[PDB]
Design a binder for this molecule. Structure first.
Ligand SMILES: *[C@@H]1O[C@H](CO)[C@@H](O[C@@H]2O[C@H](CO)[C@@H](O)[C@H](O)[C@H]2NC(C)=O)[C@H](O)[C@H]1NC(C)=O
Ligand SMILES: *[C@@H]1O[C@H](CO)[C@@H](O[C@@H]2O[C@H](CO)[C@@H](O)[C@H](O)[C@H]2NC(C)=O)[C@H](O)[C@H]1NC(C)=O
Ligand SMILES: *[C@@H]1O[C@H](CO)[C@@H](O[C@@H]2O[C@H](CO)[C@@H](O)[C@H](O)[C@H]2NC(C)=O)[C@H](O)[C@H]1NC(C)=O
Ligand code: NAG
Ligand code: NAG
Ligand code: NAG
Lengths: 322, 172, 322, 172, 322, 172
């Protein structure tokens, strides 16, 4: 037996495991977990900008001005929009909203509106505008969508109703209008005096028209009538013209797009908490430097890449050998 | 493993060797102890650092789901959207998982190669001045003090210097 | 020369080939084919549940009740639906079917209906209901879609036609109705007496209406007239109201969704055979434990994963060396 | 191959060795014959079994085409649906084919590594008691009966036991 | 010291670099660039067949026959269609074109039309057909889309207008028609005498109808009126029937599909040059044997595979060592 | 590298060796010079040619973007179409880039393996008729003229022929 030199490798107390193609559950001296699995369970400001919390209101309830949504009558810039799965406060007067999903999609790239009084209500001097319904009641009295005007007979007459607006606002403007489809003809005559009425809307590109439909339907919010809403984006310097002999639900306001950018509607039942994040999911906010996460596919902000994986651990060291 | 050193002819690792992935254990009259090979450790470290960065960087152009809604009369469109977003999700989950498995395999084999190459470097320097025991160790046919051990570790062993003492010892 | 020990490896008679990146057509001692390429060429029961074989009928011919489809008037639960590419028996009275592809898509997750007599024909006492056409003839006499009612003048009058149904059935219910668009005004007056007629339909969510169009068109099945069908899914506890002064094609029945699950419409010219499978393709049934197949992309049941590959063979053994 | 043994310095395979992938052929006064190495064969078997399971399991989250129909006024939508379903089909066909090619390569090289490592284990045990012929065989400098052959095969060869007989034979 | 033999490897003057997983910027003795990054910056003939250069015309301007597009009145087979982002010459009389994007998509698989005079203008003996507008003026005089007929009052009468065409042409035929939506009722009476008019169109499968809408709109090309165009593909041996008491914009021609195949509309502001290619991009033509390119995703012809990569270099030789 | 030869124990390449990837340098009384190993070079060439063809061919079933247009009321559909075409683009860019990186790694290691295997073949033929210097060279214990050098290069070296001259030289 003589002097010796031996060649060898590191071992330690690590119990970190990795998988390979050939072998599973291999213990290694060093490893790097590249998958974020945690979140704070909260809805937060995104880079210090809070979301728009609709609460019990839908997108339609907000923009039309359902009186249960009055807290939303003027809202500042947002980073994302929180909407419940089945918001209670939408179309208080029942009906429909044409191309509603398209409108929601637009909202994904809008971060602020300026509401502009495009067709002030007091300028309809030839028609009654104090029209409302118990279905949109406020303090036990009939009322109506705050942003809209229900034109009805004045002094037993309904002259041809004309309004127009040139978009001088400096940005594209979202404008909504409706047509009332009555339950019966007593309703039609009491409200509009006229029969065989029409609602016409025209811009440089839109020529969308309507004849109201009178017809018995099951009651929704107590009413068999319906209001069918439609919308358009009015380009800068273009004009919208409304024309009607009955059944027009006119906008009083338009929503000028005042800020654009990546946003989104998050479906959540939760409420905003006093917290800050760069990456928001519907389950909660992520704060990580890791490249992947498995929290939720629908994220907003500066986020890691979502994968379905339960684990992603890269070996960096060598097989840890007893 | 592929290169036969780690958990191979070098049957176990060293808890005693704390400051590197690969290195040496020496034994003479002056005493004994451990020492990491800094060159080989550093080369491996650089490679591994490059590896992790590469796996991450290749999956930065990865699909994102973008929230959209559909009417009750757009069920085909909704299904198409769902199949697409799920489809890319499954592709990228596959890419991430596979990449990590394949590269983990190669990472373990890389360290195995590194150990074997270090062994062979020492072997090829010591030549027949030592006995190759078969366990990662070389037993010297001469006395090899700390200075001698240090020369082996930094690849400056003097074969001719000990040749005569070794041949005499080896040949009896 | 002295005693010897030699190290070596297995070889055998295998001619199994595999490919690699570096080399092609390599012979190996052992290999595993992971691709199923075979099927039984038959359409079969799926886990003992037979498909719905439409034969020469389309989905529309079935649900409307084209008299050539009478074998389908009551059908039990199915596992998939077989439909030909161009079924002969569809709209016997020519016309159109609004959102037809959407309806077919619904059928992908429906496994059974219960047909319910929602608006019994004998309750239209103010109108003739024995209306039919030679295009839907039965035994050489004019007839009509079995599930539908063609309301016409009675005693030279057509009073306002009203019917309604509350869905108390316990599940959502598919309901179809139509509007007749006549060829000419002699037709309109002979059938409906009235002119400037309408068909209105309303639920809690649908308000879909129609004015019939009179107009010359090329003959289809001998007729220049058309019937335009529409459909809705009536929710549990909701009511549908029909209202008309002419041209309504009323449903007599609704189809309650009685079983839900993964199904599908398979396009095939073939017929069901007495065989059983867990995995059906339009080309034939698959019976395999292999993870991949290349038979057809459109499969129903518990199937391997489809790839376009002509071969997938994994080496398991070593290079087979002479 | 990568490790130089299979179809390499060990030029051919053995039809005579039926119960394993790797093993031995011995030749002495008592006679000759074949025998598989059970340990190395089993280790490889376990690896390969794990490999096949992994390739399969990684492609279980794979796209499925779902039958949908479109009107003559929905041709763009129909084309989108077709491009999507075809697109995922092509991705998964690529994934399956590539995976199998890459892993087949590594499978052949794995067996090559396994043969080389077994060879080297025996080599490192026998040392200079044998001549390394260059063809996978070691020719003994001593007589090595069945008991002796068995000790080599289960890694318990007594180098010292035969050392003197071998050195005497080797040195003439 | 004695005779020697040494084993070694090639080195050379190569400075070609490649990347690996473990290392970047590795110099190799030999390498293969597999990515084409160059193009000739020109729009060219594709296999000797020139594109259809619309110039300032849109697809609509061409097919309707805007008088600014007269060079396109008869065009030979094309290999792709060049259209500007915002062509000036489209609907000279302002309006809309229903399912326009669907029509453009059809054009992706059409390589030639034969324009067929299906409803010769001189056969409308009961109506004026010399109707036109300053918005479509030619030589300072009112004119109109060359392929269309604006039917108006003759001798203060507008009798019921009927035309029909049986497609005996031997292929499917694209047919366009329109409805005029006037600005006001003076316009309607001066042009059509009649009020409460209609435009009806019917084939074996299409029953599409219209009532014109009179309504004030902002001026486009000086006009508040609009023309709304629609189209259909008339199958072989099928008949189209037009019927109107006012406001019909009739086709005089149909476009028989005379050649089918892979084509496409390329969006470009450029002009065709005297050059030839097998692979055209909007940026310029590609001439390569390399399997990948990174020039542009939207290519026409026999092209390499597009990737976003800035580099794809495969090592073929070994590490080049000093 | 993985096999320890290239930029390894064989520390540098040869500008002098122009007609192959791997080969020899000989030195005797008749003079010196370079020569490529044709067999090993050709085997590698065939492999590499197969490799490039495979990487290309596996990405021939690759997604193509097809130009479609959408109305201002079809923004969701337009976005779906864009996300899809971009999504496949990103998948195929990933596939191409990754494949090239992984295969480049294996290409360099393949050449390294080829050099090591050629070295070992020569080593196993020359045996103890030469000294293994540790730098890719074997120094002969006998005189080895051009004919002798040629026999080594085409694998027909006569170990027994030079055995006695070598043992005598080696043993003093
Ligand atoms: C609507 O208002 C605008 C702004 O006053 C009108 O004026 C012009 O339109 C352009 C559009 O590019 C504006 O940017 C300019 O401020 C105006 N140009 C000039 C030369 O004054 C526009 O005319 C109005 N529309 C109508 C129907 O009168
Ligand atoms: C339609 O029929 C249903 C069942 O009779 C009616 O009754 C209520 O509706 C609820 C809906 O959630 C049913 O589940 C209950 O059976 C009923 N509730 C109560 C308190 O009796 C419903 O009212 C009918 N619709 C109309 C218009 O009368
Ligand atoms: C439209 O024209 C065609 C051709 O003249 C008419 O004639 C038949 O239709 C078939 C369709 O498959 C043609 O291919 C044949 O040339 C004709 N068959 C026979 C037996 O003559 C068709 O009838 C015409 N349509 C109308 C409404 O009359
Ligand atoms: C991994 O190995 C550990 C010990 O090395 C063992 O306890 C365990 O069974 C393995 N992990 C699992 C849960 O498969
Ligand atoms: C594969 O190899 C066999 C014999 O080893 C040969 O006959 C054949 O040409 C090869 N297969 C094909 C069809 O390429
Ligand atoms: C690659 O290496 C070269 C010299 O070998 C060096 O000049 C350069 O920094 C490297 N390339 C880049 C731009 O990273």
């Amino acid at each position: 037996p003589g002097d010796q030199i031996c060649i060898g490798y590191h071992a330690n107390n690590s119990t970190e495991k990795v998988d390979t193609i050939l072998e599973r559950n291999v213990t290694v001296t060093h490893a790097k977990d590249i998958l974020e699995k945690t979140h704070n369970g909260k809805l937060c400001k995104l880079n210090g900008i809070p979301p728009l919390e609709l609460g019990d209101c839908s997108i339609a309830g907000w923009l039309l001005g359902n009186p249960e949504c009055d807290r939303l009558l003027s809202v500042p810039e947002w980073s994302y929009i929180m909407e419940k799965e089945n918001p209670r406060d939408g179309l208080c007067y029942p009906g429909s909203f044409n191309d509603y999903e398209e409108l929601k999609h637009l909202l994904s790239s809008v971060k602020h509106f300026e509401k502009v009084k495009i067709l002030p209500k007091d300028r309809w001097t030839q028609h009654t505008t104090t029209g409302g319904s118990r279905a949109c009641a406020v303090s036990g009295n009939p009322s109506f969508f705050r942003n809209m005007v229900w034109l009805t007979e004045k002094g037993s007459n309904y002259p041809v109703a004309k309004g127009s607006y040139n978009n001088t606002s400096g940005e594209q403007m979202l404008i909504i209008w409706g047509v009332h489809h009555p339950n019966d003809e007593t309703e039609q005559r009491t409200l509009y005096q006229n029969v065989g009425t029409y609602v016409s809307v025209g811009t440089s590109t839109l020529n969308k028209r309507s004849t109201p439909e009178i017809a018995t339907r099951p009651k929704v919010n107590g009413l068999g009538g319906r209001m069918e809403f439609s919308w358009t984006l009015l380009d800068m310097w273009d004009t919208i013209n409304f024309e009607s002999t009955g059944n027009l639900i006119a906008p009083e306001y338009g929503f000028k797009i005042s800020k654009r950018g990546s946003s989104g509607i998050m479906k959540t039942e939760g409420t905003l908490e006093n917290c800050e994040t760069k990456c928001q999911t519907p389950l909660g906010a992520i704060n990580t430097t890791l490249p992947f996460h498995n929290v939720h596919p629908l994220t907003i902000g500066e986020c890691p890449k979502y994968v379905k994986s339960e684990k992603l651990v890269l070996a960096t060291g060598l097989r840890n050998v007893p | 493993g592929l290169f036969g050193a780690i958990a191979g002819f070098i049957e176990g690792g060293w808890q005693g060797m704390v400051d590197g992935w690969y290195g040496y254990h020496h034994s003479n009259d002056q005493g004994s102890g451990y020492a990491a090979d800094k060159e080989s450790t550093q080369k491996a470290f650089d490679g591994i650092t490059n590896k992790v960065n590469s796996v991450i960087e290749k999956m930065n152009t990865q699909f994102e789901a973008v929230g959209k809604e559909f009417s009750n009369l757009e069920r085909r469109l909704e299904n198409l959207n769902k199949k697409m977003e799920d489809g890319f999700l499954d592709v990228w989950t596959y890419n991430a998982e596979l990449l990590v498995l394949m590269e983990n395999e190669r990472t373990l084999d890389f360290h195995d190669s590194n150990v074997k190459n270090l062994y062979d470097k020492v072997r090829m320097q010591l030549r027949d001045n030592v006995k190759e025991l078969g366990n990662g160790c070389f037993e010297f046919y001469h006395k090899c003090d700390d200075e001698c051990m240090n020369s082996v570790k930094n690849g400056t062993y003097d074969y001719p210097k000990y040749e005569e003492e070794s041949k005499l010892n080896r040949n009896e």
